[model samples]
Target chain A: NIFQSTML
Target chain B: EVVDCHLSDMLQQLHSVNASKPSERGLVRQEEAEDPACIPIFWVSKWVDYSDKYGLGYQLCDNSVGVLFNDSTRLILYNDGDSLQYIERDGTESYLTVSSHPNSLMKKITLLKYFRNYMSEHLLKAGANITPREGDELARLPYLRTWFRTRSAIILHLSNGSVQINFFQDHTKLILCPLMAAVTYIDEKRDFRTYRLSLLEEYGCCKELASRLRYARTMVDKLLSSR
Candidate 1:
């Protein structure tokens, strides 16, 4: 789960 | 049974025994002695906690960069960033090149590079600089599964049954590796020391170290059991 999933 | 049991199990038993014994002035065990040169086991040597904004980023002894992102998934950049590994929350993983990664993962990929730069320019590598024997690339890379912070330290639990606890106040680190049945310590001066697990089982560790080992053992049980 990456931060800023929407962008990554 | 002693040989068969995990080092964490031995640590728990030793902590209990050490607690009962009176304060003996003599040295219970020597400072970690010089050890074998080859390393089949590895541990984190550098780390940066961006958990509030992103996640925890660290460099392994093998010069690999691992990011445990906020979403619980992981990504690894290794061989000087020649490759990338994307691990999902469910434990499935896939690999690709830096430019080869999907557009959706570009942000994370970029962050991985940022982590690499930070580590490369800002910090000194901790512990010994030993490389693991060549083998399957994925198998050789240790995966970060679960990590949490304590009041004074941060605990990192790897997939290979290795746990490293770092204390903020003293800048001391302790790595417990069951696979090798050994423990490594880096003191305030950054002196690297390696000790056999059986030595502690026999002579015991100092109370200060005994406390950390107890805390590490509890975290190991908490992490290993939850899975």
Candidate 2:
């Protein structure tokens, strides 16, 4: 789901 | 847990360990992320903690597929940070939704109130529990700030989850990391300190805390108004 992985 | 800890993924673990869920997960909520509460079937995790007015679900991150009811308004979510770092390597594979609880939420807000008395005492000083001092309080506002900050953050997480259900989902359900920032004016000290402080604050206050609170409140606000 890195799809939504935008930032830290 | 370095070097290899990189690509492996370094999740922003919760500063404070409160709920202490010996059981954690790192999967794709898919549909299990949703919350539910009923009596027809009670195989789901028992609702050890229940807050019906809030509609929160407190279940275990079991190896189940569908979301089960642990309490009234809490469930597991894709971003509801858990106690585990999920990933794989050695070759071509995939990363678990964990750091993704589907894994953890990049945002949180505490909703528990300090009532009327506790808030007053916390302002007296720092480096101490919410327990108030006698007539003369502590001078170090930054002392227990670490623990205070951590506890406050946990409470913030609870508030976020509850608000999401209360307003947005209109389900009053709480998923993973059931935290919400209970609004209050623990005097101007804690109020401005919490509402204003964020990850941006260099010392103990910053925009991150504010952003976190805003994120939770905004989503819930929109969800409730979307009707």
Candidate 3:
């Protein structure tokens, strides 16, 4: 998983 | 004035009330900023929009990573390779090496490009879509794109539990916020716009619109290049 955390 | 025209179009398209949002990183907006996270914010250039061979290159930026690819080239890269191979169109050989040694920033460029390819492939496989490109193939693994003029969606890649999933934000404001959030978390931390733009111009043969963009931002591309 390249992205660390995904929240918007 | 030419650059202004392009930006106004960008502003009109991206600055809708439906597109503004706050993310974990900060408030993400479609407008250009001194910061990197706001990028991949699509913009048009006078030269690129009018290019005969490669029309309207998408200037994809996120902090240290900014690169442009025409729509057609992007599709070719997504479906045509494994580890550094690209199929040639009407060439004597079937494939060619894509990466090359360069004095400035080639490694990061290669890395970014590789990540995108892997991301595309991973999504395709998980979605049970065909990886190979054939005539009339509706490859679902690729990133769905809307033109810079009518960008009403943002695509998200979710990775958890060793599984990767793709989500699309169909709402106008919601679409860009998530991708902006995603870019904030993942960026080329070492990127310098001066060097990046120079590399893209010299090595990749970029359009004049890119150079004009640097100038429009009051970054002295000519002096910077000379000095």
Q: Of the candidates shown, which would achieve the greatest lDDT relative to the real structure?
A: 1
Model 1 vs. true fold: TM: 0.78
Candidate 3 residue lDDT tens string, B70-169: 4322222222332222212221112223454233334434644654543333322111111111222421122212222213212221111000111223
Q: List where candidate 1 sits over 4 angstroms from the true fold.
A: A1-8, B1-40, B128-139
Q: Clashes in model 3: which pairs? A: B18-B173, B19-B173, B124-B141
Give TM per candidate: 0.78, 0.19, 0.23
Measured against the true two-chain complex, the DockQ scores of the candidates, in the order shown, are 0.04, 0.02, 0.05
- Kindly report which residue stretches of model 3 are placed more than 4 angstroms away from their true locations once superposed: A1-8, B10-100, B124-227
Lowest-sum lDDT 10-residue window in model 3 chain B: B157-166
Candidates in descending DockQ order: 3, 1, 2
Descending-TM-score candidate ranking: 1, 3, 2
Lowest lDDT 10-residue stretch of candidate 2 chain B: B140-149
Across B52-170, the per-residue lDDT of candidate 2 in tens digits comes to: 22222222222111111212112232223332221222212233333443423222112111111222232222111122222224221110000001212211122112221111111
| Sliding window of 10 residues with minimal summed lDDT for model 1 chain B | B31-40
Where does model 3 sit among the CAPRI classes? incorrect
lDDT of 2: 0.21
Chain A TM-score for each of the predictions? 0.12, 0.17, 0.18
